[PDB]
């Protein structure tokens with residue numbers, strides 16, 4: 001989270017801290033149900049052993065609502081290839097039941113047609129997580145959130161040396177230093193609609209953090225809503 | 236007041252102060268402030284002996300006058316008695332000032348103006364921009380009259396084709412003859428370029444040694460000293476491929492490489508450990524793509540958000556962390572090419588004029604460690620010191636440039652799983668990287684920062700903060716931080732958000748910024764950390780030194796054991 005400000009207590013409930021063997025978040029987590037956590041499938045290449053400390057608000061110290069949850073199994077996409085930049089999504093079934101409480105409330109799927117007609121057609125989107133407070137600044141001690149706007153397809157294509165597929169879309173600022181960064185690995189990025197935030201995607205890659213001419217390479221949630229549900233029912 | 240027409244017109248400071256004499260309360264009412272009136276009265280007092288005529292008083296109001304001590308001087312003057320431009324008072328270049336910004340702000344120092352912190356008798360002074368003079372007193376004119384309070388070459392290819400005959404070095408050590416018997420033997424020891432000459436005690440470079448011009452000096456046969464001379468500055472990013480010719484389109488992440496290495500030293504003169512650098516015994520000998528932190532470049536789906544959140548044991552097998560006989564601490568950060576030699580910085584050893592409390596028995600080494608406590612026999616090895624050799628391009632009066640040194644250990648050359656050197660080939664694949672845009676990483680442990688700046692309210696972290704400063708164009712380094720950049724001086728960084736602690740400056744000196752290549756499998760090194768302005772200070776670019784100019788003198792170091 002380059003720049004930005006802290007998630008107020010309860011403002012980012014689905015947001016989770018995937019605590020690894022050393023219990024420090026190697027990835028941004030996303031509460032999905034009483035037993036499920038969402039992260040990008042890139043997080044699977046960074047794990048010795050890992051848990052989900054839902055409700056965490058400060059990496060410095062435990063300050064309320066921190067319940068440790070253990071991933072039962074990961075639903076990795078079978079077409080998930082790093083080169084495609086696509087399907088970078090890993091649904092994390094949990095052994096420990098997620099207890100819906102303060103700072104614990106997931107983000108569920110809207111109508112696929114309505115999501116395509118409304119979610120990706122919005123103006124800005126909100127990203128949260130214990131991310132790098134600057135492009136390279138230190139990881140956000142507090143749970144810091146940030147809002148980023150949508151980017152046109154051609155702008156993302158010219159702004160990327162690589163493919164901008166039918167799903168991936170840029171979101172951020174042309175030169176302003178504010179976006180998701182190291183710490184938002186699978187960090188939940190949402191979009192407000194009548195106070196109901198909708199996860200419109202999560203950065204996968206990109207040149208630096210909110211660099212000049214660069215943007216977060218988000219994943220079109222509406223593209224794989226059917227796959228998101230089928231992985232909700234998978235494993 | 237005395238005149239009733241005064242109160243008829245509303246209060247305007249002119250009518251009380253210029254027309255007649257204005258007291259403290261009347262000037263207070265007219266100025267509607269107390270501190271402003273006090274400052275006006277102080278600048279008024281500056282011309283207590285110089286109130287006549289009025290232009291003199293105006294000169295006092297604008298200032299630019301410091302008679303006697305000058306600690307109260309708040310004017311606008313750059314010129315010294317000699318005439319050299321003053322160093323930027325906010326900056327701390329090109330030396331270590333014992334009047335740090337956290338001790339004596341009493342000067343009211345400003346970057347573009349002279350001040351007097353110590354209340355010198357001659358008047359306000361400044362540190363010289365040039366290294367010729369340690370400090371020059373700011374000659375400031377007197378108010379009202381035009382009188383002062385106190386009376387008023389580059390080297391081609393780092394010496395490959397140089398012909399200068401200078402003998403005196405920057406520190407002062409005389410040089411030994413290049414024609415001496417030991418130097419004549421070293422002429423056969425070191426492969427010299429056929430079109431270069433070496434005579435007498437002049438700073439030469441017959442072997443393409445990019446260290447700049449260095450002369451054999453007295454003491455150890457082969458000890459090197461640098462004649463005091465200036466050097467140019469160059470830029471690299473402005474060139475595209477040239478004879479490079481690797482690809483037609485653009486791709487920055489996701490590349491794999493496997494190849495061999497070409498050496499620059501005679502194998503008989505370096506022994507084991509020459510053509511194996513740039514790799515790791517565990518990770519790169521198997522030639523396998525490794526874990527999270529190195530995955531940032533290689534993962535196609537990942538280029539900005541990887542954030543492994545940890546730096547586990549042995550992530551820097553070629554980094555050195557010194558102790559002294561003083562309470563356990565690192566004087567000058569260093570990196571490892573082999574167990575026998577440690578590439579420390581030359582600043583710490585020889586700063587004070589007396590040149591003491593920096594000796595051989597003090598320094599101990601441990602290499603390739605996550606934290607400074609844990610150690611095992613198969614991780615690294617420790618041995619005593621015999622003699623330490625210093626860099627004759629450094630002193631308490633000089634500009635601290637080329638701050639690098641070594642240390643002569645006892646036990647012979649050896650490697651381990653967490654000990655492996657780093658290779659440094661030519662600029663071909665470096666240009667491939669420049670026109671392909673690949674990312675890298677830097678290492679350290681974070682104690683040189685503690686030696687140069689102090690932490691209050693938060694303990695010093697014993698773990699390296701593994702956060703990367705990517706490659707940025709040189710002018711960004713030049714204007715982000717204002718220490719002059721020599722020809723042996725490297726720069727790197729990212730578009731920063733000020734206010735937070737330095738991201739990769741959390742570390743030590745000699746911290747290698749190692750960066751993947753597509754044609755070598757050996758991640759390239761470009762800079763060795765040195766005295767940093769934005770490093771030793773808050774949240775700016777950390778400094779490095781050009782490793783391309785630090786890659787030729789290592790050949791003869793091991794043979795003194797065999798001499």
Ligand SMILES: *[C@@H]1O[C@H](CO)[C@@H](O)[C@H](O)[C@H]1NC(C)=O
Pocket residue numbers: 311312313314346347348
């Ligand atoms: C002093 O030098 C500064 C550069 O920092 C310049 O801007 C300023 O005009 C100079 N002032 C005088 C009085 O020489």
Ligand SMILES: *[C@@H]1O[C@H](CO)[C@@H](O)[C@H](O)[C@H]1NC(C)=O
Pocket residue numbers: 591592
């Ligand atoms: C080392 O420096 C200290 C200052 O704390 C001094 O007292 C001591 O004598 C020095 N050691 C020498 C001069 O051998």
